[PDB]
Amino acid sequence: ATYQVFPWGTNDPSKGSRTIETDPADKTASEFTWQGNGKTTYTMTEGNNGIAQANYDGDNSWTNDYRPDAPGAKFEYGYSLAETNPKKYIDASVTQLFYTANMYHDMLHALGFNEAAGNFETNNNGAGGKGNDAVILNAQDGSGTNNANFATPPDGQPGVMRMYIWDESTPYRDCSFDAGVIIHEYTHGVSNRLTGGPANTGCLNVLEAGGMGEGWGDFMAIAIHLKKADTRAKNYPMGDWIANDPKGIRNYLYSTSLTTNPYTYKSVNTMSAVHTIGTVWATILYEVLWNLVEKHGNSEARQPTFNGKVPTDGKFLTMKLVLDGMALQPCSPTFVQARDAIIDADKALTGGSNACELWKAFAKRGLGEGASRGSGSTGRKESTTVPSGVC
Ligand SMILES: *[C@H]1O[C@H](CO)[C@H](O)[C@H](O)[C@H]1NC(C)=O
Ligand SMILES: [Ca+2]
Ligand SMILES: [Ca+2]
Ligand SMILES: [Ca+2]
Numbered sequence: 586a587t588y589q590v591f592p593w594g595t596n597d598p599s600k601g602s603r604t605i606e607t608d609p610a611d612k613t614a615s616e617f618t619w620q621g622n623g624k625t626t627y628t629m630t631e632g633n634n635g636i637a638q639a640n641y642d643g644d645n646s647w648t649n650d651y652r653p654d655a656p657g658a659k660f661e662y663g664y665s666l667a668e669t670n671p672k673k674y675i676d677a678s679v680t681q682l683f684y685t686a687n688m689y690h691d692m693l694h695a696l697g698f699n700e701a702a703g704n705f706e707t708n709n710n711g712a713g714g715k716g717n718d719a720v721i722l723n724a725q726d727g728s729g730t731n732n733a734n735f736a737t738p739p740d741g742q743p744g745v746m747r748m749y750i751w752d753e754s755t756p757y758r759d760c761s762f763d764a765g766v767i768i769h770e771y772t773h774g775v776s777n778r779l780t781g782g783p784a785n786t787g788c789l790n791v792l793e794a795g796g797m798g799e800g801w802g803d804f805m806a807i808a809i810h811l812k813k814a815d816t817r818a819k820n821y822p823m824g825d826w827i828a829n830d831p832k833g834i835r836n837y838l839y840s841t842s843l844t845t846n847p848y849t850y851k852s853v854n855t856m857s858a859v860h861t862i863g864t865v866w867a868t869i870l871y872e873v874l875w876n877l878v879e880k881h882g883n884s885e886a887r888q889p890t891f892n893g894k895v896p897t898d899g900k901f902l903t904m905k906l907v908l909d910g911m912a913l914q915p916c917s918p919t920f921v922q923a924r925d926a927i928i929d930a931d932k933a934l935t936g937g938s939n940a941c942e943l944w945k946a947f948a949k950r951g952l953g954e955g956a957s958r959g960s961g962s963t964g965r966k967e968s969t970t971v972p973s974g975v976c
């Protein structure tokens with residue numbers, strides 16, 4: 586019922602301060618609150634969407650770990666950027682991880698990543714799909730450093746998130762407090778569930794597809810944290826706080842300038858790693874995002890608003906179209922098929938009213954009308970052409 590956290594929309598401790606959030610759960614997406622699953626209500630950081638604990642042992646069990654337990658579910662804990670021992674703020678860490686993950690669950694749910702779509706909850710409450718798969722949220726996980734990860738089994742088995750301590754800076758930095766990292770990881774769950782249907786989570790394995798797998802997560806983090814005062818000239822890094830590097834962890838900033846970020850589809854012909862390929866894809870989606878935010882407006886709301894089934898603003902419209910595309914694209918998608926799934930998602934959602942804005946963005950970075958995956962590791966033909974008749 587209270588969570589002392591960096592609030593949603595404040596990516597990390599360099600962007601703002603912590604605040605006590607009272608009952609932030611969305612009543613439709615989290616009908617038992619975050620503290621309940623319809624069997625019981627907890628005073629620990631556990632409930633329908635997530636089971637969060639300090640997994641110091643780094644193992645596969647979440648029942649042998651310390652978890653905060655607060656009377657009244659008032660998770661109000663100290664946190665200092667000067668503390669050198671991360672275990673001293675483990676309660677704040679677990680609370681922040683639980684908060685961000687639950688908030689993201691609630692947003693995704695409103696956008697259609699719900700029970701029947703293959704989402705992550707203990708009790709689907711009659712809404713379809715398979716339960717017993719609330720995300721296991723391992724704060725200060727002992728099994729690694731300077732990273733984070735997510736494991737996605739088929740619907741009905743839990744997704745598992747592991748958040749590590751990053752130690753290239755002193756004091757060390759806990760990536761529970763970098764919301765974009767949590768969002769990136771959780772999105773691995775989303776895209777693996779949606780792509781090829783919720784029973785099949787081996788659909789994003791081929792290099793180009795795993796590349797999009799990385800890019801969707803970066804994209805969702807950047808989109809969530811887009812600010813109303815931003816213009817399309819704004820650039821965003823990935824993980825600049827957790828990595829203690831103003832340029833972030835990717836090779837270029839997310840940017841609508843081809844000079845700042847020169848990546849196009851042809852760039853993938855000289856790439857061999859999912860994280861560089863994912864930077865290409867998230868940059869393409871950043872272009873889409875700005876076209877649609879300009880057309881439909883920005884927002885800093887936590888939940889979308891709908892005209893019928895269509896989100897009112899361009900931020901949630903982009904995110905909806907991206908998620909809807911994941912559920913339309915084939916297993917092992919190419920960039921081209923992922924593009925076509927997004928455009929087809931807009932045909933279904935708005936009758937194709939955003940075709941021009943979509944194609945302009947895709948064409949700008951080499952995924953225009955003539956673009957082709959080709960064959961082999963270097964066979965891609967990029968294109969800047971826009972189909973006739975759309976604009
Ligand atoms: C859930 O949220 C609102 C307010 O809590 C209403 O209860 C409504 O029934 C649900 N919202 C939507 C978009 O369906
Ligand atoms: Ca454990
Ligand atoms: Ca499920
Ligand atoms: Ca539910």
Ligand SMILES: [Ca+2]
Pocket residue numbers: 776777778779780781782783784785786788
């Ligand atoms: Ca799937």
Ligand SMILES: [Ca+2]
Pocket residue numbers: 883884885886888889890897898
């Ligand atoms: Ca809005």
Ligand SMILES: [Zn+2]
Pocket residue numbers: 769770773798799802
């Ligand atoms: Zn990733």
